[PDB]
Design a protein around this nucleic acid. Structure first.
Lengths: 79, 98, 100, 206, 150
RNA sequence: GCGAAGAACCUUACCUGGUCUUGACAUCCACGGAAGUUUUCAGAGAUGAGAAUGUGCCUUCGGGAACCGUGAGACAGGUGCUGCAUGGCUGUCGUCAGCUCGUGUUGUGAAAUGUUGGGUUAAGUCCCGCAACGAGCGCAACCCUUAUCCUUUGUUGCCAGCGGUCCGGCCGGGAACUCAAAGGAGACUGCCAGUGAUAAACUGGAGGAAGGUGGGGAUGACGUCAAGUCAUCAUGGCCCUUACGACCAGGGCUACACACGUGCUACAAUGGCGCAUACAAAGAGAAGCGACCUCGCGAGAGCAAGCGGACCUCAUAAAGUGCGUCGUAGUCCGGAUUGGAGUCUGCAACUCGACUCCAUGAAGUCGGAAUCGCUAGUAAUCGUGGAUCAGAAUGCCACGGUG
RNA sequence: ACUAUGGUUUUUAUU
């Protein structure tokens, strides 16, 4: 079973939160996929994920209870 | 000790091959007179009659696989050459072993 | 049989030599993520996911006259209907119907 | 009728076969890829040896072949007991050393393949063809046989009309199991139209 | 339209010598297993001892004579015409129908083992007070609708 | 459970955005580099940009070429649209007894005769009758296969008869009985008695292991209809080709407002549970099956004998036989929920993975209307193999026990 | 022991 239990990090996010102090202030970065889990280091960086035709803006806060990036991005256009 | 592998898909062709290697053994001195036939095997296969949308209806085809090993107690100056140069028969697989 | 799937089948043989040979001993030691819980070789862990198409996944042996995964006998490479053609020509060895 | 094939669906009984090849049971599926590699340069050499029938013979990791010809002087000259001039070609096109054999022919005009070649010569040339059909019927029925079908389809005009015709002689059982019907397929396109020639000969049962 | 039989060989009981006492087992059995039916026959005779059991040295051959199927209706024509008339069931069938009529009543008693249920229904059939008869009462009415036939 | 034996990516049609192109696939021309290996940064990747090392094949070094990287034309790619174009293969009746021919005969002719008519059959099968007659293809034959009695063999298979006996087919030793690979004999309506133009052709009885084509397979005439399919494949017309093409990463054929065949399991005590206990076929395996022995509640893991597959491996088949025990309690039987952790595999177990261990226990008393299978080793019924397979069935195909 | 429907147009002989 899973790794390592619970939500585990991805290099494609771990880099973008380390570059957040090198690239500074900017409009949201695209990451495409919705599979990754959130972690407490995602704070202060805005990102965007693919909805099936475009991208939608997402931000992480301490008010979260652990999630996948799809829990910020609905892909369906009825109900 | 050495063994000569004879494999065939028919119960009469393996005995024709046994008579062909005994006829050659009698013509290289002495080496084979009447070997053991071993246990047998079968494989059954099905084919389709219509190329599309009927696989319930089939027809059956069969092979009867035989194996003989001959087994030799002492090879000669003619066993290792003249019996190896033998072309035998078509439809049968011949190999030397060990 | 699709020329892009025939060309991929050749690329797979040449990449099984590259990403699926002499890497299994390393894969046995890098795949552990509980024994210390410490991260120190992430680039080598992401090397086990480098092969995407050349490993035993996707690879199927298929019918060798159509590329199709269906209705064939791997002991001859022929379909359940081209075996009738070849058996009617004596072109599959010893395979017969009656005449015994 | 008309799709029951004498050298197809009816070939698995009482008839001599034109190909036999031996291989490891675990690699027959791999050696299947070679069955065209042995033909691709040899098929266009058969008429250049006047061959009426070929028998492809292929021992494990080897090749032999036997060819049947009425005119071996076209490809070997005199006296016929040295086949070197053909063996050196067959071994080179196959990429492996070979030992080929040459066989004789009896009643060569009593053959569906010669009748088919004698009729195709008229239609690939867009000339008068019925003379060759009647000549083939009165050749075969007076050389042996008890009935014959010679059939033509396409470019039978009359300018740009297609049509199909045969005009049968004697009797020819095409649905009887063990009838031993001698047959050949012919199909061609002139780049201006499609043509086809179909031939069946009956000689005797079993 | 062609058969004509062919009655097929059957093995009579080894201890009582009877064909009818082997025929009972072929109807008492479940899922073709037959071996548990071979353990219920005669075991149901020791329980029947305390009750109205008929001829104990004939086991069930005389107690089956207290079960009375007699007539059959529906699925019939006479004179080429559709008719609701009853017919009398063949004597070789009447007892094989009586076998189903008793084991289908006995197994559906709400109490004890089959060896007791069957001994109750064979004692109660010998006074005509048995269970599971209302299921066939509308057929017995249809058999009494006509006495003049065609 | 059908095109399509196991659709997470892939597959793929559909759908979004990257990345690459006269094309990875077939051949030909201008120009360069050995393919390859080693490594850094950009990108999740297809790919993009740098930095080294090799100098093969071919080769008097000439430039060629497998292959790699840029150019250009003829042409390539496309499960793209369409089975009212053109092949190929095609559904079902059905092994059904039918479809036809030549020369005469007959009518104004299309058409008829024969092949209809009368008995008989599985039958256009055979007799009868005959201005129509004999023939062709289908049929029947032919071919495969089974119980019995023989026969070849004689093994690691079998043990009647005879010798010995760890008192055993075990060992002597034997080809009896099974048997393995195969070949024969038996059956002729012969015999009794009936049926019937006492014909043709059928039906009981006796004997026999089995009898009235002994049975059952395997044999596919004429064909039926604008027969099915641009989705196996071929391919015109028409379209896309800086792509609707191949390649990557996302997804869609389980989103749920409305919903259904086909098939299966319990409804008992002829059970539910813990033990005792009896009998298998079909097969299957070297980057294979994997043992011995320990560990893991278990799925599995450590590990690596033997066998190239009748003295090795998969693999103690379950229904059935008999004790103990609960009890007519919507059931101490039965099955939807429910909450997590283990084992195996894989870009990946978000999501509709499989295998494995629990607790809760709604529904269920053979089910309205309509309606299916089978004449006997048949119907019914409980288990076990084989194939697919990176990980994934009770389905597909087989086989045995009871009947 | 019981009943009426169907417009108009409408594809094989060959690549």
């Amino acid at each position: 079973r899973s790794l390592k239990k619970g939500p585990f990090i991805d290099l494609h996010l771990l880099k973008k939160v380390e570059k957040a102090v090198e690239s500074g202030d900017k409009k949201p970065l695209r990451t495409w996929s919705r599979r990754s889990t959130i972690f407490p280091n995602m704070i202060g960086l805005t990102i965007a994920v693919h909805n099936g035709r475009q991208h939608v803006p997402v931000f992480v806060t301490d008010e979260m209870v652990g999630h996948k990036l799809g829990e910020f991005a609905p892909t369906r256009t009825y109900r | 000790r050495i063994r000569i592998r004879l494999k065939a898909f028919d119960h009469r062709l393996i005995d024709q091959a046994t008579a062909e290697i005994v006829e050659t053994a009698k013509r290289t001195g002495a080496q084979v007179r009447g070997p053991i036939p071993l246990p047998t095997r079968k494989e059954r296969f099905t084919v389709l009659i219509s190329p599309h949308v009927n696989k319930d209806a089939r027809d059956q085809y069969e092979i009867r696989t035989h194996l003989r090993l001959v087994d030799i107690v002492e090879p000669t100056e003619k066993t290792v050459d003249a019996l190896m140069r033998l072309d035998l028969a078509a439809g049968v697989d011949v190999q030397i072993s060990l | 049989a699709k020329q892009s799937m025939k060309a991929r089948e050749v690329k797979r043989v040449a990449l099984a030599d590259k990403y699926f040979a002499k890497r299994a001993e390393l894969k046995a030691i890098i795949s552990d993520v509980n024994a210390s819980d410490e991260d120190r070789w992430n680039a080598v862990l992401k090397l086990q996911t480098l092969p995407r198409d050349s490993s035993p996944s996707r690879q199927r042996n298929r019918c060798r006259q159509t590329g199709r995964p269906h209705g064939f006998l791997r002991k001859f490479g022929l379909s359940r209907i081209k075996v009738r053609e070849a058996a009617m020509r004596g072109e599959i060895p010893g395979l017969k119907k009656a005449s015994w | 009728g008309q799709k029951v094939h004498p050298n197809g669906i009816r070939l698995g009984i009482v008839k001599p076969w034109n190909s036999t090849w031996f291989a490891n049971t675990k690699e027959f599926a791999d050696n299947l890829d070679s069955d065209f590699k042995v033909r691709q340069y040899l098929t266009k050499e058969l008429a250049k040896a006047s061959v009426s029938r070929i028998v492809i013979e292929r021992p494990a990791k080897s090749i032999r072949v036997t060819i049947h010809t009425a005119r071996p002087g076209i490809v070997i000259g005199k006296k016929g007991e040295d086949v070197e001039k053909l063996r050196k070609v067959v071994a080179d096109i196959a990429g492996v050393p070979a030992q080929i054999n040459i066989a004789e022919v009896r009643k060569p005009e009593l053959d569906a393949k010669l009748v088919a070649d004698s009729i195709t010569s008229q239609l690939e040339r867009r000339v008068m063809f019925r003379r060759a059909m009647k000549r083939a019927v009165q050749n075969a029925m007076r050389l042996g046989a008890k009935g014959i079908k010679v059939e033509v389809s396409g470019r039978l005009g009359g300018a740009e009309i297609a049509r199909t015709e045969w005009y049968r002689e004697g009797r020819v059982p095409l649905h009887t199991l063990r009838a031993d019907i001698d047959y050949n397929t012919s199909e061609a396109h002139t780049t201006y139209g499609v043509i086809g020639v179909k031939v069946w000969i009956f000689k005797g049962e079993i | 339209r062609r058969r004509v039989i062919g009655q097929r060989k059957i093995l009579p009981d080894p201890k009582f010598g009877s064909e009818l006492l082997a025929k009972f087992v072929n109807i008492l059995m479940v899922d073709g297993k037959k071996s548990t039916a071979e353990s219920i026959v005669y075991s149901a005779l020791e329980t029947l001892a305390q009750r109205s059991g008929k001829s104990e040295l004939e086991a069930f051959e005389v107690a089956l004579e207290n079960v009375r199927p007699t007539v059959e209706v529906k699925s019939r024509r006479v004179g080429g015409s559709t008719y609701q008339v009853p017919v009398e069931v063949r004597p070789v069938r009447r007892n094989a129908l009586a076998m189903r009529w008793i084991v289908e009543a006995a197994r559906k008693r709400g109490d004890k083992s089959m060896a007791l249920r069957l001994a109750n229904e064979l004692s109660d059939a010998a006074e005509n007070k048995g269970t599971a008869v209302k299921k066939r009462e509308d057929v017995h009415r249809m058999a009494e609708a006509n006495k003049a036939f065609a």
